């Protein structure tokens, strides 16, 4: 988007607390999260989770 | 999008089983749930649930 | 449970953040959260989530 | 418990569908799922998911 922090298919991961890692496969916006993502992890394949942007970070 | 049952907005339900009403909020797409929507609650403003297509109605 | 704060049946809410209030339906133990709850909403029939003792409150 | 398919501590994982692997950390009962178990991923340490009985089978 012509905006978003992160793309369909950045590879993300949380940044601390419960873990989680995978590609991003989505993408969700309440007033309480105006910026969130859905990601399905790399370990379990189809299980996904959704996140704040302030919870993920991209993987280099 | 040019393709999608859903919109940002659609008021829907779930179908069957566990209970789930509010507004469309989100998306997402993985192998195993290619046309996912993420919804979030009008009884509990901010939380969220992700479920495939198949499992929600609109409220008409 | 000789220990616990809340028991099965207790009617609780989430204190901040997204919404959340029903039954405690059950309940679960990790390194992370050493207790932690499972809720059925009052609102959902059918749909529960699982949260950290800290987050939630019994409804007086 | 007296009862109970499983125990804490057992490795289960998912039989079909979303994948998902690990410990039984807890365990709770609803009128739709009268026998459900909670279980912490063992590859992103600190992330639970809760199932019903049915979709689970123990680690041999």
Same mark, same amino acid.
């Given at each position: 988007?012509? %905006?978003? /922090?992160?793309?369909?298919?950045?590879?993300?991961?949380?940044?601390?607390?419960?873990?989680? &890692?995978?590609?991003? #496969?989505?993408?969700?916006?309440? %007033?309480? /999260?105006?910026?969130?993502?859905?990601?399905?992890?790399?370990?379990?394949?189809?299980?996904? &989770?959704?996140?704040? #942007?302030?919870?993920?970070?991209?993987?280099?």
């Amino acid at each position: 988007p012509s %905006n978003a /922090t992160f793309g369909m298919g950045d590879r993300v991961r949380k940044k601390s607390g419960a873990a989680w &890692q995978g590609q991003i #496969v989505g993408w969700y916006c309440t %007033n309480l /999260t105006p910026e969130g993502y859905a990601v399905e992890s790399e370990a379990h394949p189809g299980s996904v &989770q959704i996140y704040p #942007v302030a919870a993920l970070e991209r993987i280099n």
